[PDB]
Subunit: 71 residues, 3 copies
C-alpha cells in the first residue's frame, strides 16, 4: 500500500520494503530518521559532525592521521 | 517498476531511485540494510551501540568529553 | 507524486516520505546518498571503511578491544 496525500505525505506501508537500484539511490531531504537498526555493507562517509550516544567499536580509529590502536 | 505483493513485499526496481522530500523522511522498520556504500552529507546521530568492522577515519574523536587528537 | 522513467529513474517527490515496514527494509544499490542529516534510533553496523569529515563524539570508543576513555 502506497498512499499519496494532499498535505504532502507519501506513505508506504508493508512488511518488507526492497529497493533494487542498479546504479544509485539519492535521498534529498533535510533529515532522515531510521527507527531501528541500520547495517551498511560497504563503506560510510559522513560530512558533518557525528554523535554516537552509546559506545562505538572499531578495529582502529585513525585520528588526525594517527593510529589509535598503536599510538 | 513498483510491485506490491500479497505476502507483504513492496519492491521498487530501477536504475536510480531519487527521493525529494521537502521536509523529512522517516523509515520505521526494525532493520534497514544498505548493500553498498552510503554518504551522509550533513550530520549523523546514532542512539544505540555502533560497530565498524573496518577502520574508521576522523579528524578528531571527542571521547567522554575529551579530545583524542590532543589528549 | 511518484514518477517512473524510461531511462530508468524512479522519482518520489513530496513533503515527507514515511516508510512503515513491519519487518525490514533493504536498499540494494552501489551507493546511497543522503543530502541532509540522518538519525539512527537503534544501532549501526558498518562493514567497510568509514570516514567522518568532521569531529565525532562518543561516550567511549572500544579500539581493537580496548577502552579509549580508560586506557
Ligand atoms: Fe595514548
Ligand atoms: Fe594517550
Ligand atoms: Fe593514551
Ligand atoms: Pt553541520
Ligand atoms: Pt541497543
Ligand atoms: Pt571497502
Amino acid at each position: 500500500r502506497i498512499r499519496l496525500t494532499k498535505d504532502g505525505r507519501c506513505i508506504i506501508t508493508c512488511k518488507t520494503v526492497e529497493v533494487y537500484a542498479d546504479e544509485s539511490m539519492t535521498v534529498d531531504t533535510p533529515r532522515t530518521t531510521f527507527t531501528g537498526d541500520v547495517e551498511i555493507q560497504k563503506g560510510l562517509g559522513v560530512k558533518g559532525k557525528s554523535q554516537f550516544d552509546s559506545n562505538i567499536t572499531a578495529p582502529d580509529a585513525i585520528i588526525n592521521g594517527k593510529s589509535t590502536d598503536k599510538h
